[PDB]
Amino acid sequence: AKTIHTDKAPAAIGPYVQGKIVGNLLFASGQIPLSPETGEIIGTTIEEQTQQVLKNVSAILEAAGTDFDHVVKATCFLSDINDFVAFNEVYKTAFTEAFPARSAVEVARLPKDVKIEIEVIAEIL
Amino acid sequence: AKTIHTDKAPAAIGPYVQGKIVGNLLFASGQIPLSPETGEIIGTTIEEQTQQVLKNVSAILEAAGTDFDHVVKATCFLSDINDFVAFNEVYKTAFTEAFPARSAVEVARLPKDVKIEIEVIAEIL
Amino acid sequence: AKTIHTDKAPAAIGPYVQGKIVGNLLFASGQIPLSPETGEIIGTTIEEQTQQVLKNVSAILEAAGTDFDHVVKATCFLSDINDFVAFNEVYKTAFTEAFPARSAVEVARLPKDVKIEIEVIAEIL
């Protein structure tokens, strides 16, 4: 029942919270390449948008007392599956040792027409 | 371990159950705006369909001994991302004290051509 | 947390793993109809591809110490919702004593243009 909020992640504008903790698990909301500072989309390419998504996720992971290496499951929504290789190159840089389980599919459309949205489930250390 | 069975949500037709509990977590099946009384799609708008999905989810939550305020994470599958404004206004009415984490994406198509499908993970107190 | 490695399922060559265990929950990566041996697509029809997915999922379940009857939640990604009826006819044969919670949507595109992808969460007894 613990709710996660941090200003270095985009503010939850809508009927949701950035993340919620139950027991040893963190359930984070899907993060899109939004700037927590400005409030608009960061990047016109899949590489630039993926990097901002990772910053948003890392901010939420930090605020909950965990890190990328302790993420358990990641779902990666792509607006175009042909971006996978370019996305995967930036996605791997968030992790040092351990890698989580992953699912990557192409959806019809993402909020604000972004190219990438990642939702994570992480273990609380 | 324990399966959820209630006549106040649409009947689980086929190889799935309305919900399953492990530990203190409820994993509810994705709910579509089906009427548990008639089996027909309720509503032709995103507002009317979302209201039926909330009723269906609420029945599963109640059968599991929890409520909307103890949902940890929700995933909302929409057929049209442009329904976001109207969807969020109805979706928010399900809650009394707190909002869960959430992801919302546009899929290509939903079962029975509905506009919304919501799956929830909830904490059992 | 432990990591699943099995030759009986397609190898996780990249920044991801076949599955990750936290507590009594197994979070498996989304599985596609890939041959663990040849690495090619197995099956031309939804029935044939689904059977290869079930084999891949079963391998991860067996490596984790669980089975289909202890899968808690399944999310099914279809490239065409019209295949959902045929999909369920093969999907049901994987379970004997209990059915898991399920969500199913039609996405815009799946990895390698497959027809079905299934991500499961299972309980480690």
From TrEMBL, chains A, B, C:
Keywords in alphabetical order: Hydrolase
Domain of life assignment: Bacteria
Coiled coil start-end: none
Pfam families: Ribonuc_L-PSP
GO MF assignments: deaminase activity
E.C. numbers: 3.5.4.-
Enzymatic class: hydrolase
InterPro entries: RidA (IPR006056), RidA_CS (IPR019897), RutC-like_sf (IPR035959), YjgF/YER057c/UK114 (IPR006175)
Signal peptide: none
SUPFAM superfamilies linked: YjgF-like (SSF55298)
PROSITE patterns according to UniProt: UPF0076
GO cellular component, one term: cytosol
Family designation: Belongs to the RutC family.
Name of this protein: Enamine/imine deaminase
